[PDB]
């Protein structure tokens, strides 16, 4: 195009893997998924300050390893509630028609509950409705309405007729460049359904639960964590009082996103901004530990996470590594087959071409792992075994004739050893004196 300057300078702002997806309840756009780079964009989309999605996004962008670009899922709303089962100024924020920012105010729970409903009616009342029942329900008419917490102790509780188990198959179709999965419903049925979906699609599930049963005595299995443990599901659960209201899921995601899985970076002692220390006693913490329910603890002169143990039992950093190995090994072999088949020289099961896979696999996935410290190497003095990766390929004299008809190669095997981090240290000493 015609350029009217020899130089044009614009000074402006703004602009396993990183991007998380937060499955929220709202109607601010028709699509099922949208990407954002800052909380500012979500405000322009009619997200009220204090709203569930807003809390997650602001928490995720504040971490030391914040993701580059978050994603918001959409599940329909039918009604929303404001619960006042605790009170002292109880400012609330409402946005209607995408522009009407009416920050309702009230001061001093039925009185406040009814008082808040009365204040809303005093408004634009021609576009939204309110009614007290302790809690007060707020309903839109065909108008985008957003309700969020401004102050006080109340907590927002959105409700929807749609079910998470059915929406997730929908969001994936639109786009799938997202790895972390988080949900707002946080009911026992909703959480479990989300956990099962993450398995078949190889996604990492995260959830914070306010259940008091989390740190109940170990013999008592009543919390969600017990159900997932029984089903052997991998989902990074944890217990926090701010799990609602603030949706601290973003804080945890904020510590892992901008960090390549090949480094094997443990999540043991990292600090999560936004979270609040766990105040339970020593016995309670031991109980929760048996549950695989991680806790954020205020440590000696500080506060930090405790352990990245998933519900099944394996440390989280292992799970990301295992997924990262799956993805890269799959793309690397495919990327080579295309080249051969695109030159007319497609690969053949001739036993003279199969061995080439030794170099292809050792090249992209394996070596990159060693240079980053993810994969161990060397020798063991007590087990007397070496840690070097090994690869074995079957010869044409073993492939059953059934496979040759279907042109399938199976039973290839690979071996790896993972580099384990350090979590605890326990000194022991004894001051004996000479005689």
């Amino acid at each position: 195009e015609y350029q009217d300057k020899v130089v044009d300078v614009e000074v402006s702002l703004g602009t396993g893997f990183e991007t998380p997806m937060f499955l929220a309840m709202h109607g601010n756009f028709p699509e099922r998924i949208r990407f954002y780079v800052s909380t500012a964009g979500m405000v322009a989309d009619g997200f009220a300050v204090g709203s569930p999605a807003y809390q997650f996004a602001t928490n995720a962008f504040a971490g030391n390893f914040a993701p580059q670009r978050v994603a918001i899922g959409r599940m329909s709303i039918d009604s929303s509630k404001v619960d006042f089962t605790g009170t002292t100024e109880q400012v609330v924020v409402n946005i209607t028609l995408n522009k009407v920012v009416k920050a309702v105010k009230i001061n001093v729970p039925a009185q406040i509950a009814t008082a808040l409903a009365d204040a809303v009616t005093a408004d634009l009342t021609g576009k939204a409705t309110a009614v007290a029942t302790t809690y007060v329900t707020v309903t839109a008419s065909p108008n985008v309405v957003s309700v969020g917490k401004g102050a006080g102790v109340y907590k927002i509780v959105n409700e929807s007729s749609e079910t998470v188990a059915t929406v997730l198959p929908s969001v994936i179709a639109e786009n799938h460049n997202w790895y972390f999965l988080a949900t707002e419903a946080r009911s026992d049925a909703d959480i479990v359904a989300a956990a099962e979906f993450a398995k078949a699609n190889y996604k990492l599930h995260i959830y914070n639960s306010t259940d008091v049963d989390a740190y109940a005595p170990e013999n008592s299995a009543a919390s969600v964590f017990d159900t997932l443990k029984s089903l052997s599901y991998d989902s990074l659960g944890t217990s926090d009082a701010g799990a609602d209201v603030d949706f601290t899921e973003g804080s945890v995601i904020g510590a892992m996103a901008a960090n390549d899985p090949s480094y094997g970076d443990s999540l043991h002692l990292k600090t999560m901004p936004g979270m609040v220390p766990f105040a339970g006693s020593d016995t309670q913490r031991s109980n929760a530990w048996s549950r695989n329910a991680n806790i954020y603890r205020g440590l000696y002169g500080g506060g930090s996470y405790i352990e990245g143990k998933t519900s099944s039992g394996q440390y989280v950093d292992v799970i990301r590594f295992s997924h990262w190995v799956k993805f890269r090994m799959e793309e690397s072999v495919f990327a080579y087959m295309k080249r051969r088949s695109d030159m007319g020289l497609s690969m053949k099961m001739s036993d003279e071409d199969l061995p080439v896979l030794k170099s292809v696999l050792m090249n992209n996935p394996i070596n990159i792992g060693i240079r980053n410290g993810g994969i161990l190497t060397g020798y063991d003095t007590e087990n007397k075994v070496s840690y070097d990766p090994t690869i074995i390929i079957p010869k044409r004299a073993n492939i059953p004739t059934n496979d040759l008809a279907a042109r399938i190669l199976r039973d290839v095997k690979v071996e790896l050893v993972y580099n384990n981090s350090l979590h605890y240290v326990k000194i022991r000493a004894s001051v004996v004196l000479d005689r």
Binding site: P355, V356, K358, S359, M362, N363, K384, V385
Partner: protein, 78 residues
């Protein structure tokens, strides 16, 4: 090899994988490069050109040979 050498000189990428699968013998698997171009010699008969390929690691691996893990633990020493 000549085209690869010219391209490497122009751009800078010189490292490519090298693998040799021996029969009833030791094998090799490492990353190599082109060291020295041979010398042509047009004569009465058909000539021979010898390429020197340098390799990063030159430790030969028993791999295909079986019964090596057990034998290694058998050796005594102090």
């Amino acid at each position: 090899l000549a085209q690869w050498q010219r391209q490497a000189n122009v751009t800078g990428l010189i490292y490519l994988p090298v693998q040799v699968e021996g029969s009833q013998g030791l094998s090799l698997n490492t990353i190599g490069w082109i060291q020295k171009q041979p010398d042509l010699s047009y004569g009465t008969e058909v000539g021979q050109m010898d390429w020197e390929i340098g390799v990063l690691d030159a430790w030969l691996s028993p791999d295909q040979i079986q019964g090596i893990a057990a034998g290694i633990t058998g050796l005594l020493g102090l």
